[PDB]
From Swiss-Prot:
GO biological process: defense response to bacterium; defense response to Gram-negative bacterium; defense response to Gram-positive bacterium; innate immune response
Classification lineage: Eukaryota, Metazoa, Chordata, Craniata, Vertebrata
UniProt keyword list: Antibiotic, Antimicrobial, Defensin, Disulfide bond, Secreted, Signal
Protein name per UniProt: Beta-defensin 8
Gene designation: Defb8
Transmembrane segments: none
Subcellular location: Secreted
Role this protein plays: A synthetic peptide displays antimicrobial activities against S.aureus, P.aeruginosa, E.coli and B.cepacia. The antimicrobial activity against S.aureus, E.coli and B.cepacia is reduced in raised concentration of NaCl, but its action against P.aeruginosa is independent of NaCl concentration.
Expressing tissues: Most highly expressed in testis and heart.
Amino acid sequence: NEPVSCIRNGGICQYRCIGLRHKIGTCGSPFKCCK
């Protein structure tokens, strides 16, 4: 993928995210992109 996973943006990944955290995409499958 040219755009690479959401990690390229500099955000972090986690298995699950809570409302408090915001997700703009999915870092990976076993994790999600959240900040």
